[PDB]
Amino acid sequence: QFDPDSFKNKWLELHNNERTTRQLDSLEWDGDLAWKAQQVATQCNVDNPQLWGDNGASFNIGRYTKEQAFAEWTATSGSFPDDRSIPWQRIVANSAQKVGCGEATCVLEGDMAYTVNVCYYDPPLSDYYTNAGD
């Protein structure tokens, strides 16, 4: 029960609204990332996911609906440029060109299931100066 076309659209809109406000170039969807995202998402592990590749940690992860998950990431803007803002940094980085997101439905024993959301970014986040470079 899944509409891929609308799924890409919603995620792109969330990301690109945030960036458009801030005079940034929009991100384009990349399926490879979206696939990677799903791989991570499927594990049902927010804290300790098993990752692979050079850009393996270049991603955001969050619980519940898309809007809620995205907001929890952008909510960290407050403390930029410290490490707590890294989530928001991924979204807003000037160097960033591509995103791909993926989900999975995970359970709490004898409780309502919840969604796990993951988005991957390319190129990966670097140092403070590089991220704002064009």
Side-chain angles (χ1 to χ4, degrees), residues 2-107 110 113-134:
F2 185 86
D3 177 12
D5 277 345
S6 91
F7 179 89
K8 301 162 85 197
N9 275 327
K10 191 52 192 303
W11 276 118
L12 270 172
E13 201 191 25
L14 285 168
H15 278 75
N16 288 323
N17 286 344
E18 186 85 10
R19 313 189 102 236
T20 273
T21 303
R22 311 180 157 68
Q23 320 306 287
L24 295 175
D25 287 351
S26 316
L27 297 180
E28 290 180 347
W29 190 270
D30 181 72
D32 297 283
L33 296 177
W35 186 79
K36 199 170 203 136
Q38 180 184 35
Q39 217 49 50
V40 176
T42 295
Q43 316 186 19
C44 299
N45 188 343
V46 292
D47 304 307
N48 279 112
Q50 180 67 26
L51 322 164
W52 58 273
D54 301 313
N55 61 343
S58 157
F59 75 92
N60 275 324
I61 191 165
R63 220 102 73 165
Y64 324 123
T65 69
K66 295 186 197 73
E67 293 214 292
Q68 294 171 43
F70 190 76
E72 192 216 1
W73 304 333
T74 51
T76 80
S77 54
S79 56
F80 173 89
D82 78 0
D83 284 2
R84 284 101 283 175
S85 68
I86 278 167
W88 183 70
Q89 291 203 56
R90 291 175 189 299
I91 298 171
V92 126
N94 196 150
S95 62
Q97 310 245 72
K98 308 254 189 253
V99 61
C101 303
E103 77 186 38
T105 185
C106 298
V107 318
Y114 60 101
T115 323
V116 170
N117 290 288
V118 174
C119 292
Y120 257 88
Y121 305 86
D122 198 77
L125 216 48
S126 277
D127 65 76
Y128 169 89
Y129 302 81
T130 290
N131 303 337
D134 277 15

